[PDB]
Design a protein around this ligand. Structure first.
Ligand SMILES: [Zn+2]
Ligand SMILES: [Zn+2]
Ligand SMILES: [Zn+2]
Ligand SMILES: [Zn+2]
Ligand SMILES: [Zn+2]
Ligand SMILES: [Zn+2]
Lengths: 4, 481, 322, 481, 4, 4
C-alpha cells in the first residue's frame, strides 16, 4: 500500500 | 441429523421452488409450501426463512430467496446475475445453519451447482485459528447425486479463494516471507506432482541483481524470499508458460516514509498480490489445466530501522535502470520492478502481475472492481469475460504515456518511484511498472480496493476478501480450452 | 517515598533504563529493611515464564527487558498471603511502529511511573516497617521502532493462553500488564493493585485532579478513597462495566484486541482489557497518566514529574496493616 | 392475525417459560416446547427463535431468551440486570415481528410488564418520517389483562424517551428554535392542563440581560427562543419547584471556531440537553406526579457569519460576570450561564441541567454512563438510584476547585469559556457553570457521550438515543413519593 | 459540543 | 501512554  | 438449504424464486402464480425444493415439499406432503404461506410475505433475493421439524432428518430447513429464475448477464453490472443471486442466497442460508450450531448441511444445487458451492464455501469461511472462541465447523455437501463435478468445481474455486483469504488474514508475525512460501509450496504439491518449488534465499536474489527488491527488504531483520512456483500442465514441456507475478510485502509499515497508526494492521494483507496469483496456480494445478504456469512472488517486510531505505536513495534494478526511492512507502513498485524483469526470462505468453499497490485505486473504483492496466485489449477482454462469470469484477484503467512522463522526469535517476502529484495515483504507479516490462501481453491488476470485505460482497464475511482469485482461475481455464 | 518516584520518573530514559531502575529500587528496598528479597529477572526468565505479550513489546529495542520482583516480608507469619502491587515499567514510550508525534514525547521517559509509584510505596512500607507481606511486580522495557519491533496486526500469546491482536503498537502498557497481572495470581494475593501511565484519555477525563481507579471491589475502592482524603492526593472511581469489555472482545484474529474500535471511553476500554487477565475479587487498576506531571496545580510540588499517588498508596498500606 | 413475543429463562431441568409461555404451550398442546426442542441449542439471553403456525391467531411466535429468572441488582454494573435482560429480549423479539411485516404483536409481560413495554416501544422506534421507504408500523400491546398499569408505565417512560430521540434526530432545518418549542409546548399541554408555556422571543431575552446567550445566537439568522415550561402538580401552588435547564443548540457548527466536516451532522442533536429535560417534564405531567417543575431551555443555532461571536470577545452574563469567549465552539457554557442564573429566580429545591457539552465527556466515560457533576451527594445518590432501576446509567465526575482555577485565570475577564489545557475537559466546563450557580442542590449532567447509540444499548436502534430521559423521570417519581 |  |  502509498496513500491518495 | 443435519440442515438443508433450499431455494425458491420470486412469483409465477405461486413463487416456484427449485426442483429439489419441490421434491422435498412432496416428501413432507406439502408441509413446506404450507408453512411458507403461513409465515407471510414472499422471500425476495438473498433473504432467508427457517422452518423447524418438517422432516425427521432435517429439523432445520432454511429456504433462501433466489430472485428471478431467468436472471442472466446484466449489461449494466457486467456479471451473470443469477450466479450472483445464488452465491449470496446459499451463503446466507448456510450461516443460518451455523448459527443453529448444526455441523452439517445439504445445499440445494439451485440450477447451478458451481455457484451454489461457491456461496456456501465462501460464505461459511472465517479464519478462526487463533481465537479459542470459535463457531461450529459445518460440513457442506451437495443435496443430491446428480450434478457432482460442478458442485466440486465450486468447492475448488472457492477453496482457492479461501487459501488467499487465509494467507492474507494471518498476522504478519506468523505469515512471514518463509512461512508464506512454505504454505504455498505444500498447497501446490498436494494439488499435483507436476510441480516444482524454489524458495529462493537472499543470496540468490543478490546473485540475480535484484537490488530494487533488496533495498526494500533491508530495513527488517526478517529474511527476504523470492518464491518461484512451476506447474507443468502441458503435454509438451517446451510450451512457453503463462507467468504470474505478485507483490509479497508481509507487512507494509511504510518504512522511513512511515505510515499513520490508524488501521495499519490491514497492511498484514499487502502480500495479497502474492496470495491471489499463488492461489490461482494451486487451483489451476488442482483443476489440472493443460497449460504451463510460472508463479513469481518477491516476499519481504517494509520496516523502519538504522539500515532501512532512505528517501532520495538511488537503487539499480536487475535491468540496469536506476530508481530514485523518493518515498519508502512505494515499495511494491520496487519489488515488482525486479520480479517483472525476471518474468521475461521464462519467455512467457502472458505476464500478469497483481498487487495491493496504491490507496488511490481504492479512491478510484476501489471496492467494486479491481483495476487492470493492460497493453493488451485481447488480455483485457479475456479477464473481463472471466469476470462476468465469477462475478468478481475487473475494470480497465489507462496505461497512457502521459502518466509515464510524471514518473520519468526525475532528478538523480531513470525512474522516480512516485509522481510529483496526487493525481492519477494508480495510473502513475502502473506507468512505473511498464518501465520494467517489454512484453506485448501484460496486465497489472491493482488489488488494493478489493483487499477487504465489509458487507459489499454478500457471500464473504468481514475481513480479507482474497479477490480476485476466482476470475484468475476462470481466465486460466478458458485460456487452456 | 514520593520524591524517589519523582526521581525515578524525571531521570532521562538513557540513564533510567530497565536494569538501572531495578538496581536503584533494589538498593532502596534493602536499606529500608533486611526482610527483603530482590529478583531482577532477565529476558531468559521472562521467556521461561511465557510472557510473550511483554516480550513482544521489548523486542523492538536493543535495551534488555527486566521483570522486577520485590518482596517485603513484614508479617510475623511468613505464610500470610501477600498484598501484590503491579506497575507499568516502559522506560521510554515512543509508540514503536505506531509512532508518536514529536511534540513533548520527552515526557514519555516517565511511562515507567506505574513501576516507580508502587515500588516507592513498597520501599516506604518497609521503611515504616508495616506488619504485612507485600510483593512488587514491574515489567521493565522500552517501546522502540525497528526492523524487529511489533507490527500492527500481530497476534501474541499472553502467559494465560489468550491471544492479543496488537492493532496499535502504542497500547503497550496493556500488553506488559497482561503478563504481569497473570503472574500476580501466582502469589495467592489478598489484593492486586496495579498502577500505570496508561492512556491519554484518562488525562482528558479527570486528568490532573485525581488518578482514576477501576476496581471490582468497592471495599478496595473505599480503602484507597479514604487514604486519599488524608494524603490529599486524590483518587476518583471510573467504570469497570462489561459494555467496555465488549469493544475490546470483538476481535478479528484473536481473543482480545489491544485497542477499542472507538475513541470513546478510552480509559474504560483499556481497563476492560486488563480485567481479561485478572480473576481476583479485589483488584484495582489505577491509571496515573493525568497525574504524571505537575505544573502549578499541586502547590507543594514544583514543575516536573509529580510521583503521584505514592503517599495515598503508603497510607492505604498503613491503615490496611492496622 | 398477529405476532406474539414469548419469553423463556436459562435451565432448571428444562429451561422454564414465563407463565404466559407455559400457558400458550398448554394451549397448543405442548407444541411450542416440542418445536423448541427440535430447533436445537437453548436460547441464551437477548437471543431469538421464530416458530410458524403454532396457533391460528399467532402464525409467527417469537421466543426470546430472558437469561436468569432471579437476576437482580448487579454490584459491578450498577443496574437491575433482569430489567435489562427483558428490555433487550422483547426489543429483539419485536423487531423480528416487524421484519415479518406483521402489524401487531402481543408481548409477554415477562414478570415485569414495565421493562417489557420499555424494550418493545424503545426497540421498535426509528424516525421514519422523511424517508418514503419505511418499515411496517407495528402496534404493540400487552399479552394479557393482568398487569396493565405497569405495562402502560413502560409505554409512558419509553415514549418520553422516544420524544427526545425524535426532537434530537430531526434535521436542524426542520427542528429549529421555534419548531422545538412548539412541539414541546403541544406535548406538554396534552399531558395535563396544569401547564403553562412561554416561548420567550429575542426581545424578552434582551430585557432579561442574557447577553452571553444572545452572543451565541447572533451569528445565525434563525431567531433565538428561551423556552419556559411549568407543570403545576403540587396541591399547594406555593411549593418551591424542581427546576430543569437544558442546552438547546439546534445546530452546533462551532461558529468562527468552526468544526471539521466529518460527521458534523450529529450536531443537529446538540439540543439534546433541552430534549431530555423537556421530555421528562412532559412525562412527569403525563404521570401526573404531585410536584411543581419548571423547564428552562435556551434555543439557538451556532453559525459563522459577518456578525458571529469572535474569539476573544467579552460578553456579560445576566449576573454581571464577564466571560472571555476564547473559543466560539464552547457555546453551551454560554447559553447555560444565563439560563442557570435565571433558574435561581424560581426559588428551586433542586437545579438540574443537562447538556451535550464536551467531546471530552465522550473520551471519558463516554457511552456507558452520562457524567454528573454535583455539589450534592444527596442529589447524586437520588439520580444514581433511579439509574439502577431504568438501567440508563449515571456516573459521578469531580466538581473540584482545581478545575475552577483553570477557567478563573483569565486575561480580559471574570471567567474564560475554555481552559488552558486539554486535560479534564468535562471538569473544566463543569467548573465554568458552577460560576453561575449559588444553589446547594445542583447537578450538571453532561450527555455528550450518550447522545448516540450504535449497538451498545440493545433495545435502541442506531441514531439519537434520547439518554437519560427515563432516569430523570424515575428520579421525579421517587422524589414525589 | 468542543473537542478533546 | 495511546492518545485520545
Ligand atoms: Zn505496499
Ligand atoms: Zn507502501
Ligand atoms: Zn504507548
Ligand atoms: Zn460547540
Ligand atoms: Zn455544543
Ligand atoms: Zn505507554
Amino acid at each position: 500500500x502509498v496513500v491518495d | 441429523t443435519k440442515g438443508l438449504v433450499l431455494g425458491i424464486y420470486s412469483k409465477e402464480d405461486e413463487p416456484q421452488f427449485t426442483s429439489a425444493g419441490e421434491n422435498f415439499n412432496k416428501l413432507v406432503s406439502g408441509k413446506l409450501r404450507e408453512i411458507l404461506n403461513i409465515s407471510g410475505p414472499p422471500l425476495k433475493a438473498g433473504k432467508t426463512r427457517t422452518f423447524y421439524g418438517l422432516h425427521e432428518d432435517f429439523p432445520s430447513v432454511v429456504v433462501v430467496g433466489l430472485g428471478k429464475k431467468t436472471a442472466g448477464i446484466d449489461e449494466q453490472e457486467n456479471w451473470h446475475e443469477g450466479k450472483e443471486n445464488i452465491r449470496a442466497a446459499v451463503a446466507a442460508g448456510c450461516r443460518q445453519i451455523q448459527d443453529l450450531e448444526i455441523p452439517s448441511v445439504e445445499v440445494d444445487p439451485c440450477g447451478d451447482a458451481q455457484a451454489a458451492a461457491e456461496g456456501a464455501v465462501l460464505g461459511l469461511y472465517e479464519y478462526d485459528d487463533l481465537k479459542q472462541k470459535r463457531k461450529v465447523v459445518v460440513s457442506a455437501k451437495l443435496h443430491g447425486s446428480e450434478d457432482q463435478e460442478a458442485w466440486q468445481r465450486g468447492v475448488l474455486f472457492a477453496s482457492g479463494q479461501n487459501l488467499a483469504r487465509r494467507l492474507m488474514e494471518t498476522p504478519a508475525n506468523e505469515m512471514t516471507p518463509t512461512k508464506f512460501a512454505e504454505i504455498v509450496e505444500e498447497n501446490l504439491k498436494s494439488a499435483s506432482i507436476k510441480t516444482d518449488v524454489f524458495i529462493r534465499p537472499k543470496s540468490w536474489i543478490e546473485e540475480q541483481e535484484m537490488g530494487s527488491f533488496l533495498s526494500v527488504a533491508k530495513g527488517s531483520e526478517e529474511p527476504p524470499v523470492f518464491l518461484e512456483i512451476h506447474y507443468k500442465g502441458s503435454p509438451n514441456a517446451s510450451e512457453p508458460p503463462l507467468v504470474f507475478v505478485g507483490k509479497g510485502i508481509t507487512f507494509d509499515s511504510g518504512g522511513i516514509s512511515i505510515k499513520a497508526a490508524a488501521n495499519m494492521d490491514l497492511m498484514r494483507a499487502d502480500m495479497g498480490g502474492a496470495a491471489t496469483i499463488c492461489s490461482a496456480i494451486v487451483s489451476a494445478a488442482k483443476l489440472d489445466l493443460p497449460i504451463n504456469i510460472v508463479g513469481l512472488a518477491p516476499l519481504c517486510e517494509n520496516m523502519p530501522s538504522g539500515k532501512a531505505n532512505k528517501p532520495g536513495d538511488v537503487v539499480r534494478a536487475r535491468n540496469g535502470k536506476t530508481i530514485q526511492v523518493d518515498n519508502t512507502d512505494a515499495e511494491g513498485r520496487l519489488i515488482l520492478a525486479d520480479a517483472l524483469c525476471y518474468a521475461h526470462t521464462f519467455n512467457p505468453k502472458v505476464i500478469i502481475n497483481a498487487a495491493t499497490l496504491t490507496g488511490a485505486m481504492d479512491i478510484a473504483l476501489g471496492s467494486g472492481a479491481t483495476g487492470v492496466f493492460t497493453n493488451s485489449s485481447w488480455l483485457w477482454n479475456k479477464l473481463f469475460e472471466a469476470s462476468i462469470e465469477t462475478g468478481d469484477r475487473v475494470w480497465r484503467m489507462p496505461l497512457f504515456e502521459h502518466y509515464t512522463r510524471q514518473v520519468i522526469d526525475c532528478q538523480l535517476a531513470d525512474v522516480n518511484n512516485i509522481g510529483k502529484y496526487r493525481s492519477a495515483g494508480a495510473c502513475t504507479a502502473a506507468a512505473f511498472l511498464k518501465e520494467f516490462v517489454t512484453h506485448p501481453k501484460w496486465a497489472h491488476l491493482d488489488i488494493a480496493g478489493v483487499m477487504t470485505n465489509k458487507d459489499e460482497v454478500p457471500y464473504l464475511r468481514k475481513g480479507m476478501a482474497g479477490r480476485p482469485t476466482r476470475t484468475l482461475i476462470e481466465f486460466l481455464f478458458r485460456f487452456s480450452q
